[PDB]
């Protein structure tokens, strides 16, 4: 009884978290797909060349 309630409750948090994570990744792709241009590559290719 009581343990099974917490088993269900945490499964609901994880089912919601799985949707929030997918949306956050999709959102991040669109932000980067507009914020990045030639002024950023000169700060990434140069960064990699030191690594």
């Amino acid at each position: 009884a009581q343990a099974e309630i917490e088993q269900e409750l945490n499964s609901v948090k994880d089912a919601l978290r799985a949707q929030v994570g997918a949306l956050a990744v999709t959102g991040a792709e669109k932000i980067l797909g507009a914020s990045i241009d030639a002024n950023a590559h000169e700060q990434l290719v140069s960064k990699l060349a030191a690594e």
Binding site: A3, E6, Q7, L9, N10, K13, R17, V20, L48, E51
Partner: protein
Amino acid sequence: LNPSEISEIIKGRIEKLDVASQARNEGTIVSVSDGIVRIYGLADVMYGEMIEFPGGVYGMALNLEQDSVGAVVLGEYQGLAEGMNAKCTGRILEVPVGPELLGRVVDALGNPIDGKGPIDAKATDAVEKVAPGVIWRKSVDQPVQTGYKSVDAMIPVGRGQRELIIGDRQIGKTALAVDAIINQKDSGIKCVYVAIGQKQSTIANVVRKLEENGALANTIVVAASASESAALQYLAPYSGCTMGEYFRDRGEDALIVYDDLSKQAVAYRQISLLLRRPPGREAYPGDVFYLHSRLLERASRVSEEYVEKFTNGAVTGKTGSLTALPIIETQAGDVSAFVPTNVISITDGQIFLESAMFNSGIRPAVNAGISVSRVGGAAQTKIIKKLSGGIRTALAQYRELAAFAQFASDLDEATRKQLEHGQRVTELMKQKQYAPMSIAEMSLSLYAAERGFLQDVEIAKVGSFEQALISYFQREHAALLAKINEKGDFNDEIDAGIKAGIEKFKATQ
């Protein structure tokens, strides 16, 4: 359902992202067939190393040919395709370990499948390891009570011993091992149950029975069901062994059950044939002996010096152990098969279950003539060691005598005495499922038989006499049972105490 908590849980993964560059070794998938993937280009891949595929799918490198790498998928393979990149992680197969796994159901890789949340373990360990060498071990001299008088009296199991449970289908092999796990809830021994190639509803029923008997909080359940990849079914016994070894190496005792090593051998045969390795004695790989010998040699007792060296002096003056109860299935009693022959040759003893005895109502169905324990009396408490000496060989001789004297005319007193006693011990060895007996309860039952008190009792009344006697001693003699149950000690005072109680019982009940 608390908000903002989820945000900080997600922020903890975003804040800790590996944003820096990494130098990796890589390959490309060439073919995808029956759970087997072939790759080109993995120059630094080690044997048994984990391979990372797109979408978090993982594989393991098993064939390191000169021009190609043969890998097996650790999950569903149907999503993989030709041209996908295969990457290399400089890590051997590892699984989580610790007391956080107790009371949980996990897959062969340690992922939770019970829906009771994440496992906050603080330690991982390699799935494939070599057992501790000769100089680090110690002899077996501590008992492991299964709760069954037929097993605990005639085929004793000690801490660090390996005892095979073997028979045909549907005769109580799982019932014997699950009752042995249930009896450890108060013993201080941690338990591990490994299910290989079983249906998920059968696994769920075993977990429900462990929970119904109060034993789940002391058990780790490792599941590799019938629909899972042959690689996960092949690896599950080693993952469970690694979870049990955590307690052994830290000066603690553990017990592990492999519900079907014959199903692990069938999963390994599949992988090997798909990798095109040449077959042996029954289409099984040449190294099917080494599959089980490498697993079963980890179950052992380690010396105080080994525990002291492993824990860097944090634990001292304590030995550690891992006891194993592997299960094997035979076809129509045929023990000549390649896998049963190999496993019977590795364990420290075996418990043979017979279908003819099971159909005849002897339900624990232990054939005393074929079953044997190589540790013997060293694995028993003082009271059971003295009260059970010679019972196994006496029953083996009674079975022969009963067949030899079956249609012959009336024999001498020596023959009647042996036959009448063997019939009573045969009826006494019968026990019900989910009903274990303590050292004192088994001791009263053994004492009443070997000291001659059952000679006046009818065969059809032995079960009723035992149940009534135990109920009597539990009421009129509770302080004596509590004294016998402290360490299973025996002396003239306890012997006389039991004698006086049994005499008073029969003279008044």
